[PDB]
Each structure stands twice: as structure tokens, then as C-alpha cells.
Amino acid sequence: FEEKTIKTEQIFSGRVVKLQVDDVELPNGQTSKREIVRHPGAVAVIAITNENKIVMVEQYRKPLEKSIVEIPAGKLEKGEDPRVTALRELEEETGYECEQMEWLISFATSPGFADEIIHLYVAKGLSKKEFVDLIELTLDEALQYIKEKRIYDSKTVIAVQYLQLQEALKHKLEHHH
Amino acid sequence: FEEKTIKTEQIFSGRVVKLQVDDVELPNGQTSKREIVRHPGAVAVIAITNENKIVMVEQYRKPLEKSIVEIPAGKLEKGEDPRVTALRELEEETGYECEQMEWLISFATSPGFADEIIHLYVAKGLSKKEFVDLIELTLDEALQYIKEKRIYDSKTVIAVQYLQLQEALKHKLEHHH
User: Fold this and answer.
1) Pfam families this protein is in (chains A, B)?
2) Which of A160, B63, B121, B143 has the fewest CB atoms in 10 Å of its CB?
3) Across the interface, do B63 and A115 touch by the CB < 8 Å criterion?
4) Rounded Cα distance, B120 and B161, in Å
5) Which fold does the domain A42-168 belong to in CATH?
6) Per-residue DSSP letters for B23-75?
């Protein structure tokens, strides 16, 4: 099943948001329009300190009219290596360097209207290389921020769940025959 | 910290996407613009059958140019009860009724430019009340769809992680003194 684009019209081209509408041909020969936001995507980092606290930053989010606590993340620049962007983000936003930075998962944030993709990485073995909006939380503190709706966006909820699973699964070992 | 809106201009008002730009006053008296997509939000359902399979639907997502496998979800209508919308979605999209439908968490999908909120519910005790794009997966099958990037959006990754945690934590019991 595929919706072939016959024509694209740009509605808006901003510093964050590009909006376009595609005239598309349905497999039945009917035609219709698809509103599409284009977004360069983002890299995000789950950084877990040697005290096992997850590193976070408080950001003001104008669309929500509130500040929320998030894992660090940066815009992916044109043709840039996401892992390189990830490492720049750890240092610039938290002032931490790591020993490893490894890709965990990639996902769309809202594929019903946007093509934005998040690339989620895990940084382990942190040490420092100033930071007013920097917050380090224990796992239990993070779960409490979720209860409080201070943590409140997809990618940060996924990171907290990941830390949770890493604790809950740390003895797992399957031996098949 | 707050960005007061001085004025709003509507750029576009569609069937899915509303785009506006706010002129806002920074706390320092500087001014700037914020591009904001308005979205009514969505309710989504984690439905776990009595065989412990999670219920999913394959959707074509034009912004990604591909079909992906997702938990069921529906637009929240103006002033509607999200739990009522959730239950309508279970029946209409999967043909399942449940015994309980309970709110798990709410979150923003991309708060850097959109106000879209997802309300995530869990349905337990399913029985049927036709479905070409309906898929039921074991937990291990779901993890494999993630490996394959067939599962590929925030809310479905959160649901899979939840099923994972529910298995991994099923013996937990803390007794404090």
C-alpha cells in the first residue's frame, strides 16, 4: 500500500518547522492531500553516572507553556554523523565525557504528520571535562518526576523505562538447548 | 522562566495540522518567534490478550513513506472523555471489548514544536464483541519487530517496554520498616 506524491506545495519554511502539503494518488485512483511537517531529526543521550543517576536538563517548552525535565538531545545537522552529534551534546550541555556511546534505537515521534526521527544513544563511563539547568536523578527520583509530570515527553519516558529495565533484568541469563 | 506571547499569526489550518507563529517576549526584554503546531492530541491503548499477546495495527504513514506496526490510537475530540475515546478505539479498530481500561501515563510527542499529547491507557481482560491490518504479537515477537524497525514510533516503543517491565517485575514486593 503506497500513496504516490503527485505534487508538493510548501506552506512554510522556518527555523524549526517546515510544512508542506502533498497531493497524493491513492491505490484506488482517488486523490487526497497529506499535511507533512519536515524536521531534520534529533539525537538523544541516556547518560548514567557512576552513582547510577540519569543525567537530565530542564527546558522551557513554549508549545506546552511549561518547563519539563528531559534527557539531553541535539538537532541532527545536514549529513552529520549522529554519534558525533551525540558526543558534542554530552559535553556542551552536561560537561561530561564518556568512554562509550552506543546506539540503542531509532523512532518517529509523531508519524501521523511529522517525519521527525529520534536517534537514541547510551553513554556509559562518565567523567567530567557552569550547568544551571542540569539535574541528575536516581531511578526512583526519575519515576517520581514522572508521577509529578515534570518528566513529560516520549524520549525521556523511553529512557526512564530503559534504566528501569536495566535494573529489573540485571540477573537475566538464558541458556538454550 | 516564561515566554509571554505578544501576538499569534495562523499560518495554516488543515484537517490534521494547525500551524501558528507566536511573537513572544523573552524575560530579558528581547523578542523572538516560536513556531507551534497545534494538535488535538490522541488516546492510545495497550491491549494484552489472555494469551499475553499485545494487540497492534499496521498503518501506512505518509510522512515516513512506509507502513509501521502500532498500538491502536484515536484522535481526541473536542471536550471528549479520553477513556471513552479509548474504549471506542478498542472496539472499532480491534473488535475487542475489555473489562478494565485504566490510564497509565500522558506525554508530549515533540514539545520542541508541537503541543500534541498522547494519553496512554491499558486494557485488560479482553474478549471479542473483519480486521485486515490487525496483528497480535508475543512479547518476544514485538521485540523482534523493533529489531526489524517494523515497530518504529514513540508510543509503541513505550508500550513494548511496559509489557517488558510487567514481565520482568512480576515477582517484585518491597516491605519497608
Assistant:
1) NUDIX
2) B143
3) yes
4) 13
5) Nucleoside Triphosphate Pyrophosphohydrolase (3.90.79)
6) EEE-TTS-EEEEEEEE---EEEEEEB-TTSPEEEEEEEEGGGTEEEEE--EEE
> Are the beta carbons of A157 and B35 separated by less than 8 Å?
no
Identify the DSSP state of A169: T
3-state secondary structure of A75: strand
User: Resolution of this PDB entry, in A?
Assistant: 2.1
Cα–Cα distance for residue pair A115/B64, rounded to 1 Å: 6
* DSSP symbols for A123-154: EES-EE---TTEEEE-HHHHHHHHHTTSS-BH
Q: Helix, strand, coil % (nearest 5) of chain B? A: 25, 45, 35
Domain range annotation of chain A: 4-38, 42-168
Contact A111 B34 (CB under 8 A): no
B71 grid coordinates: 498500538
